[PDB]
Each structure stands twice: as C-alpha cells, then as structure tokens.
Design a protein around this ligand. Structure first.
Ligand SMILES: CO[C@H]1O[C@H](CO)[C@@H](O)[C@H](O)[C@@H]1O
Ligand SMILES: CO[C@H]1O[C@H](CO)[C@@H](O)[C@H](O)[C@@H]1O
Ligand SMILES: CO[C@H]1O[C@H](CO)[C@@H](O)[C@H](O)[C@@H]1O
Ligand SMILES: [Ca+2]
Ligand SMILES: [Ca+2]
Ligand SMILES: [Ca+2]
Ligand code: NA
Ligand code: NA
Ligand code: NA
Lengths: 145, 145, 145
C-alpha cells in the first residue's frame, strides 16, 4: 500500500545512516552485499571462528578480487596476517570453504600452497596473497556478515 | 507480494550486519530482544537515566538471570558498580521498576536489601548481585534498548 | 497483513537499538531525520567530500538552527573548525548548496562573508557562526546521512 511504502522508506533511510556512520568511522568495510569487520584481536583459527559466529557472522573468506582486497586492507591496517574461512581437504593442496564447497577464487602467493597436508589453514599476507599454514597461530580476527 | 519479500530480505540482512559489527566490537550486548550498552561514564542515577533516555533507551534493569549476567559482565569489564533501573517503594524493602511495576526477578547479595528506606536506589556488584544504595554515587551508565 | 506488521515491528525495534547504541556512545548525532558523524579527521574540502560520499553520505550542511547547533557541538568537541557543504556562486557574497540550490539558512559571524570571491568555501567556528574561507585548509570532516 501507501503507508507501507512510507514505512519502508524511513527504515531504509535509517539503515543507510547507521551503516554510513559505521563505515565513515572505519568500523566496517562494505563490499557488495558483504560486510567485513574486525575486533582487532589476534587469535588462532578456532578462536576467530567462535568470535565471528558469536557476533552473528562468520570468519571472513574472499570469493572475489574486490572482497580479497577489502580484507587485505584490514590486514595492512592492523599490520598482521588474517586467517581466512577455509580448510584443506583430505587430498593435500585442495581447500574447501567451511560449508564444504570447493574453493573457487584463490590468490596464493607464488609457490603456495605447499605444506602437503601439514598446514590445513590459510593465512592472508598483508599484500593480499595467501599461504597455507597451521591453524594454531595468532592472526587478526576478521569476520564477514 | 514478491518484490516486498525481497526488500525485507535485504533490510533484515543489513540490520544483522550492523548489529553484528556492533557486537563483534563489543559496543553492545544482545540478550533475547534486549540490547545493553554503556558510554563508559560513571555518574549518578539521575544522570544515567538522562543519558539513556537521550539515546532513545532506558537505564538497564535485568528481568532474567541471563539479562542479569549480561549486565554483570559489563560491570566486570569496566570494573565498576552499575545502577539498575529500579527504585524503592514507600514500604522499605520493596522495589519497583521505573514504570511502576513491582520487581519480580531479584539477585540481592546475601543480607540485602537492608537500608530501611534510606537507600532508594539499587547498585549491581561486579559479581552480579545487588545492593540497595543511595542514588547519589557515581556508577557505570548501562542502558538497554 | 498481520505477519508483516510483526516483521516490521522487530525491524524497527532493531534499528532503534543500533541507532541508540551509536548515539549513546557519541558516534553520531541525530537531528530530525538527519544524522551527523565525524571520522575525527582534519582535511581539506575536496578530501572531506570524498570521505563522506564514500561512506554513503554527504559533507554536512545545516539548514536549521538545530542542525547548526548539532554540528557546532561536534566542532566544539573536537575543537576545530568544520567545512560546510556549500560553495560561493559566481556573484561573490552569494553561496549555494552543492546540489546547486541557493542557501536559505545562514549563520555568518558578524561581518561575514567578506572575501569577495577569493574564498569559495565556508567554515564553521566552534561557536557555530560561519566564515567564508579558502577550500584548502584542514578542517574536521563532518558528514550527514
Ligand atoms: C616454515 O614454512 C613457512 O614458510 C613457508 C614459505 O614462506 C610457508 O609456505 C609455510 O606455510 C610456513 O609459513
Ligand atoms: C554503609 O553501608 C554500606 O554497606 C552496606 C553493606 O555492604 C550496604 O548494605 C549499604 O547499602 C551501603 O553500601
Ligand atoms: C585573512 O583573513 C581571515 O580572517 C578574516 C576575518 O577573520 C576572514 O573573513 C577570512 O575569511 C580569513 O579567515
Ligand atoms: Ca605454506
Ligand atoms: Ca544496602
Ligand atoms: Ca571570510
Ligand atoms: Na597443507
Ligand atoms: Na532503602
Ligand atoms: Na569569497
């Protein structure tokens, strides 16, 4: 109806306002329909995952060059590597998103991955390239919503 | 209709994103349908009330164990007592929410309350238990929305 | 319908919560339907404009006394002048909003403006009054959404 179109207008305006404030202050990065954010903490994979799910999101994982660059800027900003939301399959060298799906977009640093199943996790260098590594290091916690 | 179901989807997704960012960064605590937050200030009862109403909320008051524990964690976090949204009735020993209703859930520290009408307000210890006290002390301002 | 009225209720409640948290923590100022916010940075006009548009908003411009006072408080808070969203027309002494429209509400400091076309921009003093100035100074970035 009409009164509905009005309601939805204010609602959408208010959401734009809150998101604008959050982005202006650098509390989050918006890329397409995905929002990235970090609590500034450096912890291991399992810890990061918990923090993200607890906030209603998931450990971040880039699926496009633009998403990858957004995460890289946060890593650069806090000057620390970032654990991405993906783990190695049974067959070494092969990685999958946590939902199980096979990884499509990748940005491995030349030569990577090369840990032969010893390094199940994936960390992002400050330049955005990836490196498979063990899941017990302390990495910047970056979540996506 | 259909286009409406689509609109509402993005709107709900965007709200989840902003709330997720706010919770991930510890700017707020979500418990059920209630959101708690503090400006980090330590002021008296009347001041806190003003700050909260000015932000569009109310001075926090726990009505369930989970809500009580959420507030307690903030008190613990800032290491300071928290004034709760409730005041003593005419009959000492009896307290009511600011809307007038009688207090149901309580978590008095053993022996409390025992100020015999001299202490109209209620402060929360860092362990979550309550103590009736005067309303002129400087306590962490915690609001609920 | 009914289920819709319910959906919209939670949505509106959640927006109030996020906006309340943001205002309680001083991350933004709400005046009517306008929200003001600053990233705390001091840069020139062109830079500010970019930062604001990038966050989904615009460089702030007061159109009412209340809006003017809100911006002034931010300037006072960060103790710095604020560039407003307006520039001088061809005819010196005349200013227009960036959308082109003619400026209606004004709050020039006594004697201002008086740069005779040499100062195309407008800066706000910490007391809220305006002064036309060059657009190359470093001013607090305040955006409106
Ligand atoms: C000890 O090996 C480390 O360095 C190589 C090359 O940098 C990485 O591939 C590996 O995952 C470890 O981070
Ligand atoms: C001086 O009394 C104080 O201590 C007792 C016991 O701790 C409280 O009950 C009371 O409200 C005051 O805080
Ligand atoms: C050098 O002139 C400066 O001071 C006058 C008066 O304060 C302003 O009008 C002008 O824009 C400049 O800021
Ligand atoms: Ca490796
Ligand atoms: Ca007492
Ligand atoms: Ca001037
Ligand atoms: Na490996
Ligand atoms: Na009492
Ligand atoms: Na001028």
């Amino acid at each position: 109806d009409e009164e509905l179109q009005t309601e939805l207008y204010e609602i959408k305006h208010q959401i734009l306002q809150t998101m604008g404030v959050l982005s202006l202050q650098g509390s989050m990065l918006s890329v397409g329909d995905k929002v990235f954010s970090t609590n500034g903490q450096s912890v291991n994979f399992d810890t990061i995952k918990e923090m993200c799910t607890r906030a209603g999101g998931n450990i971040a994982v880039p699926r496009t060059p633009e998403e990858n660059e957004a995460i890289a800027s946060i890593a650069k900003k806090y000057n620390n590597y970032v654990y991405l939301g993906m783990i190695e399959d049974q067959t070494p060298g092969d990685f999958h998103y946590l939902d199980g799906a096979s990884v499509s977009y990748t940005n491995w640093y030349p030569g990577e991955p090369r840990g032969q199943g010893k390094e199940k996790c994936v960390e992002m260098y400050t330049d955005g390239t990836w490196n498979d590594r063990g899941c017990l290091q302390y990495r910047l916690a970056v979540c996506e919503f």
